[PDB]
Amino acid sequence: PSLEDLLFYTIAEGQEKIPVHKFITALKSTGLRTSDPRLKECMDMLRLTLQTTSDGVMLDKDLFKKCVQSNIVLLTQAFRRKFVIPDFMSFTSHIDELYESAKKQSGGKVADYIPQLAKFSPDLWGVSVCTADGQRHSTGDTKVPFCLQSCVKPLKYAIAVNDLGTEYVHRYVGKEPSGLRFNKLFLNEDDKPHNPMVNAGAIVVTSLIKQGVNNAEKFDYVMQFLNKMAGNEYVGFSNATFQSERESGDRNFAIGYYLKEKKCFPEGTDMVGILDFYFQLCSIEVTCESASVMAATLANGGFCPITGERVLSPEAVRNTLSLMHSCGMYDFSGQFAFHVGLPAKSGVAGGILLVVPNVMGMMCWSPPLDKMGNSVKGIHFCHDLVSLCNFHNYDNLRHFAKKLDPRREG
Amino acid sequence: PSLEDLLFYTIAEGQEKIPVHKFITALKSTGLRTSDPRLKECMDMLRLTLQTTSDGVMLDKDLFKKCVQSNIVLLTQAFRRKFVIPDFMSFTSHIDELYESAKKQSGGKVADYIPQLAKFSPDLWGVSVCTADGQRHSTGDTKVPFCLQSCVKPLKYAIAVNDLGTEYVHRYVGKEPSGLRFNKLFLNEDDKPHNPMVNAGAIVVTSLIKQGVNNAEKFDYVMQFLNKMAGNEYVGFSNATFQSERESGDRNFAIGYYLKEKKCFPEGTDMVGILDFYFQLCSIEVTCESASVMAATLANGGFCPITGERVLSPEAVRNTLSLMHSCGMYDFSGQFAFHVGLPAKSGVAGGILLVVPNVMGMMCWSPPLDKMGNSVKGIHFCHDLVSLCNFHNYDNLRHFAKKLDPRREG
Amino acid sequence: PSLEDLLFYTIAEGQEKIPVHKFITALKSTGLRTSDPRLKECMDMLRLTLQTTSDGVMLDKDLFKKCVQSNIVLLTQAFRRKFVIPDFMSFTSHIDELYESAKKQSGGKVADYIPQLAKFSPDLWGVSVCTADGQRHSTGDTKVPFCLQSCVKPLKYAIAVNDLGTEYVHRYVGKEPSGLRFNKLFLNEDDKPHNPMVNAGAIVVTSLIKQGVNNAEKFDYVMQFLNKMAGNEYVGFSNATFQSERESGDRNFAIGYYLKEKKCFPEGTDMVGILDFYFQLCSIEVTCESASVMAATLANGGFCPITGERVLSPEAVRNTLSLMHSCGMYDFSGQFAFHVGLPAKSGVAGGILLVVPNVMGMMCWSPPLDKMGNSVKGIHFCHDLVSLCNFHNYDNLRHFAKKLDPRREG
Amino acid sequence: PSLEDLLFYTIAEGQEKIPVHKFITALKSTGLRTSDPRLKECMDMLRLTLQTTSDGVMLDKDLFKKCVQSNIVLLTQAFRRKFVIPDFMSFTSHIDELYESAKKQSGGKVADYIPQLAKFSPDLWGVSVCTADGQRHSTGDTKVPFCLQSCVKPLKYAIAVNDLGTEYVHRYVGKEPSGLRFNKLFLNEDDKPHNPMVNAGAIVVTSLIKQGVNNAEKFDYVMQFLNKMAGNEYVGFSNATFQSERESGDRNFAIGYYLKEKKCFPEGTDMVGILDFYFQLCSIEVTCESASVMAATLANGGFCPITGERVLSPEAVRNTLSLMHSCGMYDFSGQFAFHVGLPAKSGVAGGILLVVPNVMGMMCWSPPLDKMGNSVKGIHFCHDLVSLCNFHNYDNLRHFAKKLDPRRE
Ligand SMILES: O=C(Cc1ccccc1)Nc1nnc(O[C@@H]2CCN(c3nnc(NC(=O)Cc4ccccc4)s3)C2)s1
Numbered sequence A, B, C: 001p002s003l004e005d006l007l008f009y010t011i012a013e014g015q016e017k018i019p020v021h022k023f024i025t026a027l028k029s030t031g032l033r034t035s036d037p038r039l040k041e042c043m044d045m046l047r048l049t050l051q052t053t054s055d056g057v058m059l060d061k062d063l064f065k066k067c068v069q070s071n072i073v074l075l076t077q078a079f080r081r082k083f084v085i086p087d088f089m090s091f092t093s094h095i096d097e098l099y100e101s102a103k104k105q106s107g108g109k110v111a112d113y114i115p116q117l118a119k120f121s122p123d124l125w126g127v128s129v130c131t132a133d134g135q136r137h138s139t140g141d142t143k144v145p146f147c148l149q150s151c152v153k154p155l156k157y158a159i160a161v162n163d164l165g166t167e168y169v170h171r172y173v174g175k176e177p178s179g180l181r182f183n184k185l186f187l188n189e190d191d192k193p194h195n196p197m198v199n200a201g202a203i204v205v206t207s208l209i210k211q212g213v214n215n216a217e218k219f220d221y222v223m224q225f226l227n228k229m230a231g232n233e234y235v236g237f238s239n240a241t242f243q244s245e246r247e248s249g250d251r252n253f254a255i256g257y258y259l260k261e262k263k264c265f266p267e268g269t270d271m272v273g274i275l276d277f278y279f280q281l282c283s284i285e286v287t288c289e290s291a292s293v294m295a296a297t298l299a300n301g302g303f304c305p306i307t308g309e310r311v312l313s314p315e316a317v318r319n320t321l322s323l324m325h326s327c328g329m330y331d332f333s334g335q336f337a338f339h340v341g342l343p344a345k346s347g348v349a350g351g352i353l354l355v356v357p358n359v360m361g362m363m364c365w366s367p368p369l370d371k372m373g374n375s376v377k378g379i380h381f382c383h384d385l386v387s388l389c390n391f392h393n394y395d396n397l398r399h400f401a402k403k404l405d406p407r408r409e410g
Numbered sequence D: 001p002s003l004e005d006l007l008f009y010t011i012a013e014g015q016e017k018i019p020v021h022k023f024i025t026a027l028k029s030t031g032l033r034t035s036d037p038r039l040k041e042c043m044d045m046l047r048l049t050l051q052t053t054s055d056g057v058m059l060d061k062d063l064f065k066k067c068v069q070s071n072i073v074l075l076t077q078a079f080r081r082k083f084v085i086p087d088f089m090s091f092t093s094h095i096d097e098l099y100e101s102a103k104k105q106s107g108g109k110v111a112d113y114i115p116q117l118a119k120f121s122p123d124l125w126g127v128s129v130c131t132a133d134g135q136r137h138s139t140g141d142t143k144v145p146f147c148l149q150s151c152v153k154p155l156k157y158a159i160a161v162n163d164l165g166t167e168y169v170h171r172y173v174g175k176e177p178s179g180l181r182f183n184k185l186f187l188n189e190d191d192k193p194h195n196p197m198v199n200a201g202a203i204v205v206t207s208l209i210k211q212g213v214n215n216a217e218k219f220d221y222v223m224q225f226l227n228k229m230a231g232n233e234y235v236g237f238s239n240a241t242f243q244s245e246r247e248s249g250d251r252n253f254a255i256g257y258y259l260k261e262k263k264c265f266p267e268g269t270d271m272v273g274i275l276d277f278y279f280q281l282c283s284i285e286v287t288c289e290s291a292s293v294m295a296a297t298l299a300n301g302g303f304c305p306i307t308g309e310r311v312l313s314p315e316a317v318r319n320t321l322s323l324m325h326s327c328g329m330y331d332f333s334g335q336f337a338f339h340v341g342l343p344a345k346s347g348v349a350g351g352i353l354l355v356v357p358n359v360m361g362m363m364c365w366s367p368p369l370d371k372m373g374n375s376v377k378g379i380h381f382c383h384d385l386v387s388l389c390n391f392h393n394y395d396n397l398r399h400f401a402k403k404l405d406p407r408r409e
């Protein structure tokens, strides 16, 4: 008996050897990417044996075992259809029609707040999927960088809860939606911002991360933290929006000064500096692939799906998903929690960092926003997504009408 | 091969025949109860053949086989560990520990609004479980009748959505929590009550059920409905509470008139009569066992777990859980949604109607309310429950730290 | 070779005989209805031979031959997938999603002009399809009667051109849209109403049908036509609406008198009587199944698709479609012609008579009008339909980007 | 089995060889022209073997194969009568009678406003066809160059929507016909010109193409666009016409200043410069064969029929065909939309750029205009054409009286 041989004959045909063009397209059809970090060791050993004999792309029973032996447990669950979406290619084609049915919603206005965001083209539209098992798919402008803006608010909240714990973090920021009331107010009635997803609350959260060290070290700590959430995929920084958001942020300055008398920061806070750190964190750049992985990290209880590493404590992810449910889409949050039922977070660059817990993480991106600040195409996509699969938070995994459950086979 | 045979040797021990108490204790240890409605044919023939011969209580291979023949698909999931809680015996032992730690919380005040709820003892405390598969467990004062009071609000909202649909019903009622600055107002800014879980909204929803018939017919139409949600377990009516809620509903009479003014009911509504219907629906009686099956029907996508009949549409159940999530615990809702993450509804009688979607429904009952109107022991129980199992809506089903997952073996 | 046999083994499986439910579910899935008038002999002889032996139910090669013998030419085009939409099962599955996306549009207000249209519920919403070959599908409230109102204008225009020819009819009525300052004016500068689709023009056209005869026969002559256009499905008359349009038609009276000094009718016209006839023609009743067949006759060059009968001359059908293109949706006509590109007609009752030439006719109905008088749901549906298929008048039948073409296989 | 063999034997006679005149006249009778760009390799391989031995003009099955292998799938649908007009030879003979019945209509007066248009003879008259498959036919004066004038308005509108998209373009110009005495006003009540086919709208459209570059580069971008649209057939520039349109263009200046005041352009517009661009764009030269291919690109969903290239987005072609339907013939537009049912666009030079969607494009040219500005012969031809074939937009492709349908056998 052997796990490697059994997998060999499943791909082999009962034939003697496997061409390695056939092995990787068998692999790519599980949705995995040959660049998966949990597979380097297997593809490190395939570029090795694809120089030893440049003739015969072919692989014995025994040559197969020494390329895959290292990663075999992850490869067979991929090949025994044991990933969270077993027929991943069927699901991606649904992602495709979902992408392109959203593609003809030309409504919306791109943020003119800054010359750096009006800059971005209204025809950009990208959707990226990463499952809790690492299966990936993209369509549209999926590797164009854009800034997270307020899509970083759950990520910095998670970091704060991860390092400091729920109870401390919420001495300083609430945990409830304000109400379609106070788009306008900074503080709840305990003189705390309502929740980490609104600018007043985000700024307070930003004040908590890595106290006692300067703002350059603090920023690097969030960036290496954000690196782990993304499996070390792309996360950058556009100094252009950063310097443009510091010239044009009188209300963050309004909020900041509002927080000082009201003694909403912890002792020793340099508010004007924290405003700079906040402006930096909102100009962090990602793609939808990058961001989809961080989404999937939250989809996966704090484990990065493409590295297997523990990034965020489960307590941090639960809280972060809790509040993205209720507060994550500006004024549209309650409507969104009702009709979509997914923890999501939107940003002025056109991003929606969407999380389907226990299934997949996603990132949508189209710069045209509606009049509540949400990517028009993005909102459309998530409505269609829940309208077609039982990813809604309170769909039943047993009785779900004419919806699909991509989590199951036949 | 034939299931009744396969199941026969599973209990048989490899022995000759199965005594019927050995079969009955094996079944009850799966958590099913011999009175299960989906088991009635099987238990009708065990009582019959234990009259056909008053000696030897043992069961041949066909004597067993033609007693379970009608019900075999359910008995096998029961005996093959295929229910959603496979190790139900330890899970109830946890419910017991959970029950008894809430039992030493002597705080709270019993609602003295009317002599009928001040009548109730502060030492009454009951918790009842019913799973999406029909498994039951109770502890404490579990068959004492009490009125749902506002535990009926999700149930009548579901009924309304089932017959009229989301889009119609929500012409008349909102779908968001007010904000804990608006426990006080009746209407949001589209002049709709904020959501079905608050008195103004329940009252509007009640105005929608079964228009065109008188209040006696409406009441029975809702009552037959609650019978189906409860698998025909106890659903009653306390006329004592109803007549006393007719004296002391100046706020409801306030709300009713405020709503008729603002053109909030559908045309042709007799508001004062709807108020009478509303007081009726709030004085409908249950026990925790009755009501736990009621909750399990929403846990189960609208199928009553102990009868298999479809009671509520999936759209009705999803919306009802969506709004119990955010609006279900009066002012404690946002705190509840954060710390417990379970769709729940409380009532001034001491009830909390709790739903763990895809797993189980429950009803806890202790009349002493805290200063926000929620059962003290109930609130204590629900916090302990999710701190011990990954039932929180945004717990991860794969990575959940030191919590238990009763959905899996060990 | 023989045509009945060839169709026999195509369904037969090569097997036995054909169960007659298997023949009829095969027939219905082409979209035909067993009630089709061109199939009456086949279903008469199938109901007959399912009495000749009450106990079959199967079909010999010679028994199949004598049930389909009279109808074989139509059944083969149905079974050789030679109808204008070959995969009708796909297309109706799309129509359903189109219907359900329009169902969530709660905007609009029902015409309260007369108590007869305010009666109608805002949640009535029906869509019905009939192809140039007779294939049908409906969804929603498709056999609820409503009056054509101004959906009759294209039809009476067609009747007029069919009997009198283009050149005579347009002595009295123009053939161009007014332009959106002239919603308000009755006559162009040749002292003719602008076109047959606006009230002044219809009223003049009403004056041309069946001159020299009294109003009872005139109405009856139009009713014979509309029965023929609908294959004798439901077309009725609402005396309720007619008398209320008799009370509240000061404008048609205003218009009627304005048309009389300017000598706009033919000699010998009794203007007030013509106004009465026009009021009758507007309160004629249909359902969307009924009316969808009327649209399909215009889609089909004047032949009723479900009877094969020639109803309108090609000249009448072309002109009526020419003018529904530009003038058919009130103030929205030019926008509708741009974004939808289909000959359509709207009515105050909530109807939209839509024609996809050479393909199919449809009738959408939801009584809520927008602020220009067009069914909100109808307008929404018509956008999504063309946004989904290459039916736009000026889509290309070869290069049409990511749109669907139901005229094509795969 | 092999297609070059099959096509060889369908042409061959069943004899062993084909004279290559028999192959060329058989090819021209499908209506394709040996100059078709999609046949270039094929004619490269017979320009070559028509030197290997200069007499003995005949072709084996393997020699035939090595010239047509490169172009084989386009050549058989040509020879298996699978083009959208299978019997092109009768259709062109119908186009001929339509040409000659229209040629006897001398009504009209040549545009006399500028000397360069007075220059043109009243008896010049050309009609050229190009089908969605590349079949070509002409009659009369079909590569005498003349300016598009206002026949360019759909093309610059197509370019605009192709690069910028429908929603942007129609921020600045409407999408409906004005009303028959609103020929005189420049703006509707949203302060946009009514549509891209009227001068105010065209002038605004001209303001949208290729912003941020100077007017020499702008003009070159449009001509690269028109080159692709015509499959690189004739497109020129009459500097004579351009100088008469600038000396004598007071309404455009009126329009330009009226639009600038009402802020009808996008920010950063140089109005007097855009008027200059608009005047040159209107002096672009074509022939009827040239333009008929441009028409055929619009008949064909934005793909040029003689090169296979994707030129215009499908969204762009639909909108342009939409608006040529309702707004394309000046005051005669509504009448034309009723009786002809074809998207057409007329110009002061005497052109009518006509499109039969999914079938063919054509360009008519006779300089005598009627009293609404449309070529008399062009208008006559467009009436007779639909009077003969079910090309009317709302003709039925199934029940169509005695009109003939060249699309079927
Ligand atoms: O003008 C409108 C419009 C309007 C609409 C309908 C009716 C009337 C007016 N809206 C404004 N929004 N913000 C404004 O000014 C500043 C920025 C936000 N600031 C606040 N944060 N938190 C607050 N409240 C408490 O903290 C309660 C509290 C609870 C317990 C103790 C102390 C205070 S105010 C102050 S003005």
Ligand SMILES: O=C(Cc1ccccc1)Nc1nnc(O[C@@H]2CCN(c3nnc(NC(=O)Cc4ccccc4)s3)C2)s1
Pocket (backbone or CB within 6 Å): B184, B185, B186, B187, B188, B189, B190, B191, B258
């Ligand atoms: O007890 C206090 C204490 C208090 C605390 C701090 C300062 C002093 C006093 N305050 C009261 N709260 N409620 C009261 O009773 C009234 C009956 C119901 N009323 C309303 N319901 N819903 C509404 N909706 C809109 O108003 C939206 C809307 C609609 C159109 C435009 C704008 C907004 S009004 C209010 S008294």
